[PDB]
Amino acid sequence: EKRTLIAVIADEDTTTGLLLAGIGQITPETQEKNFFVYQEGKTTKEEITDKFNHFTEERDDIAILLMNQHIAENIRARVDSFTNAFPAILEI
Structure with missing residues (x-):
């Protein structure tokens, strides 16, 4: 399909x-980055939410969004309310 990349x-x-x-490396053809680093005490819940919606609703080539469970726990209601077919969210 169109959805081939992991975020x-x-x-x-x-x-x-x-x-x-x-x-999470740079896609050569678009030069987009495919990762965002969570840093306890630095990254706010709003930034995590913004990066979530980006990889999830503002990109269209993502097949799978990988996140640490504990990061998904930080935005659990945003994650549990995600409903689209793609990308699949896997908590690692």
Whole structure:
């Protein structure tokens, strides 16, 4: 389909491992980034929510949004209210 890419909302260590596996890297043709780093005490709930809606409603090439469970817990009502077919949200 059109939806081929994985997006990432993840703490520092998970992002590091994902970027080593090539996940969340820049899409060559569009130059878009496919990751946002959560930093406890720095990132607000509003920024997490904004990045969520971006990867989820403002991008159209995302098949799967990966997030740490604890980050999904921080915005659980926004996550539980997501209803679209795509992307699939997987909590890691």
